[PDB]
């Protein structure tokens, strides 16, 4: 029935926001904005022309291209508040959204209390730390679409629409939008393998659990701890 899996809650929060937003604006008489909710995504991405850095930002969906060149692909956003390629690109020109990087940033900054697995972080540290700008999975690697491994990946060589096994908050099996395809392009090769390093952080982190507990995981901090059943008489 519930799967072993991320909610993506940050980035629902994320996209209901940019829609509140897009109807306030289209009340201040921004007609472009005046439209119905399904059109309507918060991507973190470039603008149009001169908008060159990546900023949260709530797009038109009728206004994005389907396919992106380099610097212009949208990202959306993992629940440990990771930018993570989502399909689609940034018309320069024609883009239809409205920057709103402050908002979109602090919901990130409070979905990730809420939803980022302290097993999970402690890896995407370690990663971060000595790969900068990379986040932990356990996916695959260049050229083979069989085999899986921890490694820090480049987070722009990642597919959000493909799921690949991340840490619960239990330090159990789960799994994340931000994937590999295990596909031989350039992008494929944007990783860096650390099994011992990332299962190392991965231990370190203190169970949110007593030792007389089973910890379950959750889609949201905290899991739940069961006391364990005892010797009973069955
Ligand atoms: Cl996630
Ligand atoms: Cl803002």
């Given at each position: 029935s519930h799967s072993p899996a991320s909610g993506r809650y940050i980035q629902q929060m994320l996209d209901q926001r940019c829609q509140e937003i897009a109807a306030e604006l289209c009340q201040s008489?921004?007609?472009?904005?005046?439209?119905?909710?399904?059109r309507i995504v918060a991507r973190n991405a470039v603008g149009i022309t001169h908008q060159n850095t990546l900023q949260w930002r709530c797009f038109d969906?009728?206004?994005?291209?389907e396919s992106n060149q380099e610097n212009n692909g949208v990202n959306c956003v993992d629940d440990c508040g990771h930018t993570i390629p989502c399909p689609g690109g940034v018309h320069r020109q024609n883009s239809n959204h409205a920057t709103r990087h402050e908002i979109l940033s602090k919901l990130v900054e409070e979905g990730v209390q809420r939803f980022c697995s302290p097993y999970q972080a402690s890896a995407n540290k370690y990663c971060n730390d000595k790969f900068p700008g990379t986040i932990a999975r356990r996916s695959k690697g260049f050229g083979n679409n069989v085999e899986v491994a921890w490694r820090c990946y480049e987070k722009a060589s990642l597919l959000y629409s493909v799921y690949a096994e991340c840490a619960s908050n239990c330090g159990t099996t789960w799994y994340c939008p931000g994937g590999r395809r295990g596909t031989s392009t350039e992008l494929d090769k944007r990783h860096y393998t650390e099994e011992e390093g990332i299962r190392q952080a991965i231990g370190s982190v203190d169970s949110?659990?007593?030792?007389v507990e089973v910890c379950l995981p959750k889609?949201?901090?905290?899991p739940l701890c069961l006391d364990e059943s005892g010797q009973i008489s069955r």
């Open positions: 008489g921004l007609r472009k904005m005046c439209v119905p909710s399904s969906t009728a206004s994005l291209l949110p659990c007593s030792e889609d949201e901090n905290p």
